[PDB]
Ligand binder design. Structure first.
Ligand SMILES: C=C[C@@H]1C[C@]1(NC(=O)[C@@H]1C[C@@H](Oc2ncc(OC)c3ccc(Cl)cc23)CN1C(=O)[C@@H](NC(=O)OC(C)(C)C)C(C)(C)C)C(=O)NS(=O)(=O)C1CC1
Ligand SMILES: [Zn+2]
Length: 192
């Protein structure tokens, strides 16, 4: 079969400093994927998650751990209670959700209306994005695709640290992203 998505690290957004911590290497992974059973307690708002050869991110908002379909597929996620089946799946939005793991802290949907956003990458870089549309934002500095690869599923935050959306796709030209496309938190709330 397909295995379970496996948490292999996490990104802290609490406090004053965003940072990444690796929690599981490629070795432990295989067995966790197969069983869906992961002894590890979940911490933090953003998980670094993995399938057999690829990693991406998952963000807890409103008690649901959200990520992208093009990463998770229809997969279950490994947890200390065994494989957790997806709570939400929407292929057209590229969205999947699981009940937020114990004991993740969950982000609050933003109702600020700020146009100044921040995208959190898999390395825990926090990069400024200017909101442009409902689901797009411009990068202040263009980035090569390689830099944003594996950060899908991560959060776009407002200045106060609320979730504005989930990074879905890079708006790019000839391998350079000038903007990011995301699932707005309102679309998530609608899916709920
Ligand atoms: C390099 C950074 C990007 C952020 C990143 N996401 C991507 O690569 C995404 C994947 C794909 O989009 C979509 N797939 C499936 C869908 O449904 C199942 C979609 C439903 C709706 C929409 Cl919107 C898009 C969808 C193409 N794409 C692009 O970003 C593409 N961009 C793009 O399509 O841009 C527009 C949407 C503006 C056209 C392109 C490949 C050209 C960069 C990533 O890191 N992925 S990853 O490495 O973590 C991997 C999960 C393991
Ligand atoms: Zn806000």
């Amino acid at each position: 079969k397909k295995g379970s998505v496996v948490i292999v690290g996490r990104i802290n957004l609490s406090g004053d400093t965003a940072y990444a911590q690796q929690t599981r290497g490629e070795e432990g992974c295989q067995e966790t994927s197969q069983t869906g059973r992961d002894k590890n307690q979940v911490e933090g708002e953003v998980q670094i998650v993995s399938t057999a050869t690829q990693t991406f991110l998952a963000t807890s908002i409103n008690g649901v751990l959200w990520t992208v379909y093009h990463g998770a597929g229809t997969r279950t996620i490994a947890s200390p209670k065994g494989p957790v089946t997806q709570m939400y799946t929407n292929v057209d939005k590229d969205l999947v959700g699981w009940q937020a793991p114990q004991g993740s802290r969950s982000l609050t949907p933003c109702t600020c209306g700020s146009s100044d956003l921040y995208l959190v990458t898999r390395h825990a870089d926090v990069i400024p994005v200017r909101r442009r549309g409902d689901s797009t934002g411009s990068l202040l500095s263009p980035r090569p695709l390689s830099y944003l690869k594996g950060s899908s599923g991560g959060p776009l935050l407002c200045p106060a640290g609320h979730a504005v959306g989930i990074f879905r796709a890079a708006v790019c030209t000839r391998g350079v992203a000038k903007a990011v496309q995301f699932i707005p938190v309102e679309s998530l709330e609608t899916t709920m």
